Protein backbone atom coordinates (compact mmCIF):
# COMPACT_ATOMS: atom_id res chain seq x y z
CA UNK A 1 0.00 0.00 0.00
CA UNK A 2 1.40 3.37 -1.08
CA UNK A 3 -0.84 6.45 -0.98
CA UNK A 4 0.29 9.62 -2.74
CA UNK A 5 -1.37 12.88 -3.82
CA UNK A 6 -4.86 11.68 -2.96
CA UNK A 7 -6.31 15.16 -3.55
CA UNK A 8 -4.49 17.35 -6.06
CA UNK A 9 -5.01 21.03 -6.93
CA UNK A 10 -2.89 21.93 -9.95
CA UNK A 11 -4.07 25.56 -9.95
CA UNK A 12 -5.19 28.13 -7.41
CA UNK A 13 -8.19 27.65 -5.12
CA UNK A 14 -10.31 30.74 -4.61
CA UNK A 15 -11.60 29.81 -1.16
CA UNK A 16 -12.55 26.83 0.99
CA UNK A 17 -15.63 26.86 3.20
CA UNK A 18 -16.27 23.11 3.36
CA UNK A 19 -14.01 20.14 4.08
CA UNK A 20 -11.01 18.99 2.05
CA UNK A 21 -9.88 15.58 3.29
CA UNK A 22 -7.19 13.42 1.74
CA UNK A 23 -8.03 10.14 3.45
CA UNK A 24 -10.50 9.14 6.15
CA UNK A 25 -11.07 5.89 8.01
CA UNK A 26 -14.09 6.90 10.07
CA UNK A 27 -17.11 8.79 8.81
CA UNK A 28 -19.80 11.29 9.79
CA UNK A 29 -18.60 14.10 7.52
CA UNK A 30 -21.13 16.94 7.31
CA UNK A 31 -20.59 19.56 4.63
CA UNK B 1 2.15 1.60 4.39
CA UNK B 2 3.70 4.88 3.23
CA UNK B 3 1.56 8.03 3.16
CA UNK B 4 2.84 11.10 1.33
CA UNK B 5 1.32 14.37 0.09
CA UNK B 6 -2.23 13.31 0.89
CA UNK B 7 -3.55 16.82 0.14
CA UNK B 8 -1.58 18.86 -2.39
CA UNK B 9 -1.96 22.52 -3.40
CA UNK B 10 0.26 23.24 -6.39
CA UNK B 11 -0.79 26.91 -6.56
CA UNK B 12 -1.89 29.60 -4.14
CA UNK B 13 -4.96 29.30 -1.91
CA UNK B 14 -6.99 32.48 -1.57
CA UNK B 15 -8.40 31.71 1.87
CA UNK B 16 -9.50 28.84 4.10
CA UNK B 17 -12.64 29.05 6.23
CA UNK B 18 -13.41 25.33 6.49
CA UNK B 19 -11.27 22.31 7.38
CA UNK B 20 -8.26 21.00 5.47
CA UNK B 21 -7.27 17.59 6.86
CA UNK B 22 -4.62 15.29 5.46
CA UNK B 23 -5.62 12.11 7.27
CA UNK B 24 -8.19 11.29 9.92
CA UNK B 25 -8.92 8.12 11.89
CA UNK B 26 -11.95 9.30 13.82
CA UNK B 27 -14.88 11.25 12.42
CA UNK B 28 -17.50 13.87 13.23
CA UNK B 29 -16.15 16.55 10.90
CA UNK B 30 -18.57 19.47 10.53
CA UNK B 31 -17.87 21.97 7.77
CA UNK C 1 4.25 3.28 8.77
CA UNK C 2 5.93 6.46 7.54
CA UNK C 3 3.90 9.68 7.31
CA UNK C 4 5.33 12.64 5.41
CA UNK C 5 3.96 15.91 4.01
CA UNK C 6 0.35 15.00 4.75
CA UNK C 7 -0.83 18.52 3.85
CA UNK C 8 1.27 20.40 1.30
CA UNK C 9 1.04 24.03 0.15
CA UNK C 10 3.37 24.57 -2.80
CA UNK C 11 2.45 28.26 -3.12
CA UNK C 12 1.38 31.08 -0.82
CA UNK C 13 -1.76 30.95 1.33
CA UNK C 14 -3.69 34.21 1.50
CA UNK C 15 -5.22 33.61 4.93
CA UNK C 16 -6.47 30.86 7.22
CA UNK C 17 -9.66 31.24 9.25
CA UNK C 18 -10.56 27.57 9.63
CA UNK C 19 -8.55 24.52 10.68
CA UNK C 20 -5.53 23.03 8.90
CA UNK C 21 -4.70 19.65 10.43
CA UNK C 22 -2.09 17.22 9.19
CA UNK C 23 -3.24 14.13 11.07
CA UNK C 24 -5.91 13.49 13.69
CA UNK C 25 -6.79 10.43 15.73
CA UNK C 26 -9.84 11.77 17.54
CA UNK C 27 -12.66 13.76 15.99
CA UNK C 28 -15.21 16.49 16.65
CA UNK C 29 -13.71 19.05 14.26
CA UNK C 30 -16.02 22.02 13.72
CA UNK C 31 -15.16 24.40 10.90
CA UNK D 1 6.28 5.04 13.15
CA UNK D 2 8.10 8.12 11.86
CA UNK D 3 6.19 11.40 11.46
CA UNK D 4 7.77 14.23 9.49
CA UNK D 5 6.54 17.50 7.95
CA UNK D 6 2.89 16.73 8.62
CA UNK D 7 1.85 20.26 7.56
CA UNK D 8 4.08 21.98 5.01
CA UNK D 9 4.00 25.57 3.74
CA UNK D 10 6.42 25.92 0.83
CA UNK D 11 5.63 29.63 0.36
CA UNK D 12 4.60 32.56 2.52
CA UNK D 13 1.40 32.62 4.59
CA UNK D 14 -0.42 35.94 4.60
CA UNK D 15 -2.05 35.51 8.00
CA UNK D 16 -3.46 32.89 10.35
CA UNK D 17 -6.68 33.45 12.28
CA UNK D 18 -7.71 29.82 12.76
CA UNK D 19 -5.84 26.74 13.97
CA UNK D 20 -2.83 25.10 12.33
CA UNK D 21 -2.15 21.75 14.00
CA UNK D 22 0.41 19.19 12.91
CA UNK D 23 -0.89 16.21 14.87
CA UNK D 24 -3.65 15.75 17.43
CA UNK D 25 -4.69 12.79 19.56
CA UNK D 26 -7.74 14.30 21.23
CA UNK D 27 -10.44 16.33 19.54
CA UNK D 28 -12.92 19.16 20.03
CA UNK D 29 -11.27 21.58 17.60
CA UNK D 30 -13.47 24.61 16.89
CA UNK D 31 -12.46 26.85 14.01
CA UNK E 1 8.25 6.89 17.52
CA UNK E 2 10.21 9.87 16.17
CA UNK E 3 8.42 13.18 15.61
CA UNK E 4 10.14 15.90 13.59
CA UNK E 5 9.07 19.14 11.90
CA UNK E 6 5.38 18.52 12.50
CA UNK E 7 4.49 22.04 11.29
CA UNK E 8 6.84 23.59 8.74
CA UNK E 9 6.92 27.14 7.34
CA UNK E 10 9.42 27.31 4.49
CA UNK E 11 8.77 31.02 3.87
CA UNK E 12 7.78 34.06 5.90
CA UNK E 13 4.54 34.29 7.88
CA UNK E 14 2.83 37.67 7.72
CA UNK E 15 1.09 37.42 11.09
CA UNK E 16 -0.46 34.93 13.49
CA UNK E 17 -3.72 35.66 15.31
CA UNK E 18 -4.88 32.08 15.89
CA UNK E 19 -3.14 29.00 17.26
CA UNK E 20 -0.14 27.20 15.75
CA UNK E 21 0.37 23.89 17.56
CA UNK E 22 2.87 21.21 16.63
CA UNK E 23 1.42 18.35 18.65
CA UNK E 24 -1.42 18.07 21.15
CA UNK E 25 -2.61 15.22 23.35
CA UNK E 26 -5.65 16.89 24.89
CA UNK E 27 -8.24 18.94 23.06
CA UNK E 28 -10.63 21.87 23.38
CA UNK E 29 -8.84 24.14 20.91
CA UNK E 30 -10.91 27.22 20.04
CA UNK E 31 -9.75 29.33 17.11
CA UNK F 1 -43.21 52.93 3.18
CA UNK F 2 -42.18 51.31 6.47
CA UNK F 3 -39.72 48.39 6.44
CA UNK F 4 -39.28 46.32 9.58
CA UNK F 5 -37.73 42.93 10.43
CA UNK F 6 -37.16 42.01 6.79
CA UNK F 7 -35.13 38.93 7.79
CA UNK F 8 -36.00 37.34 11.13
CA UNK F 9 -34.24 34.54 13.03
CA UNK F 10 -36.36 33.51 16.00
CA UNK F 11 -33.85 30.87 17.15
CA UNK F 12 -30.11 30.35 17.04
CA UNK F 13 -28.10 30.20 13.80
CA UNK F 14 -25.36 27.58 13.76
CA UNK F 15 -23.10 29.38 11.29
CA UNK F 16 -23.17 31.70 8.29
CA UNK F 17 -20.89 31.17 5.30
CA UNK F 18 -23.00 32.89 2.65
CA UNK F 19 -24.76 36.26 2.53
CA UNK F 20 -27.60 37.44 4.77
CA UNK F 21 -29.02 40.69 3.39
CA UNK F 22 -32.07 42.51 4.68
CA UNK F 23 -32.68 44.79 1.72
CA UNK F 24 -30.79 45.47 -1.51
CA UNK F 25 -31.32 47.99 -4.29
CA UNK F 26 -28.56 46.88 -6.63
CA UNK F 27 -27.73 43.31 -7.58
CA UNK F 28 -24.90 40.97 -8.52
CA UNK F 29 -25.08 38.82 -5.39
CA UNK F 30 -22.96 35.67 -5.70
CA UNK F 31 -23.44 32.98 -3.07
CA UNK G 1 -39.39 55.91 4.63
CA UNK G 2 -38.48 54.39 8.00
CA UNK G 3 -36.13 51.40 8.14
CA UNK G 4 -35.82 49.43 11.37
CA UNK G 5 -34.39 46.04 12.37
CA UNK G 6 -33.78 44.96 8.79
CA UNK G 7 -31.87 41.86 9.95
CA UNK G 8 -32.87 40.43 13.33
CA UNK G 9 -31.24 37.65 15.37
CA UNK G 10 -33.46 36.81 18.34
CA UNK G 11 -31.06 34.13 19.64
CA UNK G 12 -27.33 33.49 19.63
CA UNK G 13 -25.26 33.14 16.46
CA UNK G 14 -22.61 30.45 16.58
CA UNK G 15 -20.24 32.07 14.09
CA UNK G 16 -20.17 34.27 11.01
CA UNK G 17 -17.84 33.56 8.09
CA UNK G 18 -19.84 35.24 5.32
CA UNK G 19 -21.48 38.65 5.04
CA UNK G 20 -24.33 40.02 7.17
CA UNK G 21 -25.62 43.25 5.63
CA UNK G 22 -28.63 45.22 6.78
CA UNK G 23 -29.10 47.40 3.72
CA UNK G 24 -27.13 47.89 0.51
CA UNK G 25 -27.51 50.31 -2.38
CA UNK G 26 -24.73 49.02 -4.61
CA UNK G 27 -24.00 45.40 -5.40
CA UNK G 28 -21.23 42.93 -6.19
CA UNK G 29 -21.55 40.91 -2.97
CA UNK G 30 -19.52 37.69 -3.11
CA UNK G 31 -20.15 35.12 -0.40
CA UNK H 1 -35.43 58.90 5.99
CA UNK H 2 -34.67 57.47 9.44
CA UNK H 3 -32.42 54.41 9.74
CA UNK H 4 -32.26 52.55 13.05
CA UNK H 5 -30.98 49.15 14.21
CA UNK H 6 -30.30 47.92 10.68
CA UNK H 7 -28.54 44.80 12.00
CA UNK H 8 -29.67 43.53 15.40
CA UNK H 9 -28.19 40.77 17.58
CA UNK H 10 -30.51 40.11 20.51
CA UNK H 11 -28.24 37.40 21.97
CA UNK H 12 -24.54 36.64 22.09
CA UNK H 13 -22.40 36.12 18.99
CA UNK H 14 -19.84 33.34 19.27
CA UNK H 15 -17.35 34.80 16.80
CA UNK H 16 -17.13 36.88 13.64
CA UNK H 17 -14.75 35.99 10.82
CA UNK H 18 -16.62 37.63 7.94
CA UNK H 19 -18.14 41.09 7.49
CA UNK H 20 -20.99 42.62 9.49
CA UNK H 21 -22.13 45.83 7.81
CA UNK H 22 -25.11 47.94 8.81
CA UNK H 23 -25.42 50.02 5.66
CA UNK H 24 -23.34 50.33 2.50
CA UNK H 25 -23.57 52.66 -0.49
CA UNK H 26 -20.78 51.21 -2.59
CA UNK H 27 -20.15 47.54 -3.24
CA UNK H 28 -17.45 44.95 -3.86
CA UNK H 29 -17.91 43.06 -0.59
CA UNK H 30 -16.00 39.77 -0.57
CA UNK H 31 -16.78 37.32 2.22
CA UNK I 1 -31.41 61.80 7.36
CA UNK I 2 -30.79 60.47 10.88
CA UNK I 3 -28.65 57.35 11.35
CA UNK I 4 -28.64 55.60 14.71
CA UNK I 5 -27.51 52.21 16.03
CA UNK I 6 -26.79 50.84 12.57
CA UNK I 7 -25.16 47.71 14.04
CA UNK I 8 -26.42 46.59 17.45
CA UNK I 9 -25.09 43.87 19.77
CA UNK I 10 -27.51 43.39 22.66
CA UNK I 11 -25.38 40.66 24.26
CA UNK I 12 -21.70 39.78 24.51
CA UNK I 13 -19.50 39.08 21.49
CA UNK I 14 -17.05 36.23 21.94
CA UNK I 15 -14.45 37.52 19.49
CA UNK I 16 -14.07 39.48 16.27
CA UNK I 17 -11.65 38.41 13.54
CA UNK I 18 -13.39 40.01 10.56
CA UNK I 19 -14.78 43.50 9.95
CA UNK I 20 -17.63 45.19 11.82
CA UNK I 21 -18.61 48.38 9.99
CA UNK I 22 -21.54 50.62 10.84
CA UNK I 23 -21.70 52.59 7.61
CA UNK I 24 -19.54 52.72 4.50
CA UNK I 25 -19.61 54.95 1.43
CA UNK I 26 -16.81 53.33 -0.55
CA UNK I 27 -16.29 49.62 -1.05
CA UNK I 28 -13.66 46.93 -1.51
CA UNK I 29 -14.28 45.17 1.81
CA UNK I 30 -12.47 41.82 2.00
CA UNK I 31 -13.41 39.50 4.85
CA UNK J 1 -27.34 64.61 8.74
CA UNK J 2 -26.85 63.39 12.31
CA UNK J 3 -24.83 60.22 12.95
CA UNK J 4 -24.97 58.60 16.37
CA UNK J 5 -23.99 55.22 17.84
CA UNK J 6 -23.22 53.70 14.44
CA UNK J 7 -21.74 50.57 16.07
CA UNK J 8 -23.13 49.62 19.48
CA UNK J 9 -21.95 46.94 21.93
CA UNK J 10 -24.46 46.64 24.76
CA UNK J 11 -22.46 43.91 26.52
CA UNK J 12 -18.83 42.92 26.90
CA UNK J 13 -16.57 42.03 23.96
CA UNK J 14 -14.23 39.12 24.58
CA UNK J 15 -11.53 40.24 22.16
CA UNK J 16 -11.00 42.07 18.88
CA UNK J 17 -8.54 40.83 16.26
CA UNK J 18 -10.15 42.38 13.18
CA UNK J 19 -11.40 45.88 12.41
CA UNK J 20 -14.24 47.73 14.14
CA UNK J 21 -15.07 50.88 12.18
CA UNK J 22 -17.94 53.24 12.87
CA UNK J 23 -17.95 55.11 9.57
CA UNK J 24 -15.70 55.06 6.51
CA UNK J 25 -15.62 57.18 3.37
CA UNK J 26 -12.83 55.40 1.53
CA UNK J 27 -12.42 51.65 1.17
CA UNK J 28 -9.87 48.86 0.87
CA UNK J 29 -10.63 47.24 4.24
CA UNK J 30 -8.95 43.85 4.59
CA UNK J 31 -10.04 41.66 7.49
Author numbering:
A (entry chain B), B (entry chain D), C (entry chain F), D (entry chain H), E (entry chain J), F (entry chain A), ...: 12 to 42
The article reads:
Type II fibrils are made of two S-shaped protofilaments, which are related by a C2 symmetry in all three models. The interface between the two protofilaments is rather small, involving only two symmetric hydrogen bonds between K28 and A42 of the opposing subunit. Strong, localized densities can be observed close to K16 in murine type III, DI1, DI2, DI3 and murine type II Aβ fibrils.
Alzheimer’s disease is the most common form of dementia and is neuropathologically defined by the presence of extracellular plaques containing Aβ in the brain parenchyma and intraneuronal neurofibrillary tangles containing phosphorylated tau. Peptides between 37 and 43 residues in length are generated, with those of 40 (Aβ40) and 42 (Aβ42) residues in length being the most abundant. These Aβ monomers tend to aggregate into insoluble fibrils, the structure of which has been extensively studied in vitro by cryogenic-electron microscopy (cryo-EM) and solid-state nuclear magnetic resonance spectroscopy, revealing a spectrum of different polymorphs. Here, we determined the structures of nine ex vivo Aβ fibrils from six different mouse models by cryogenic-electron microscopy.
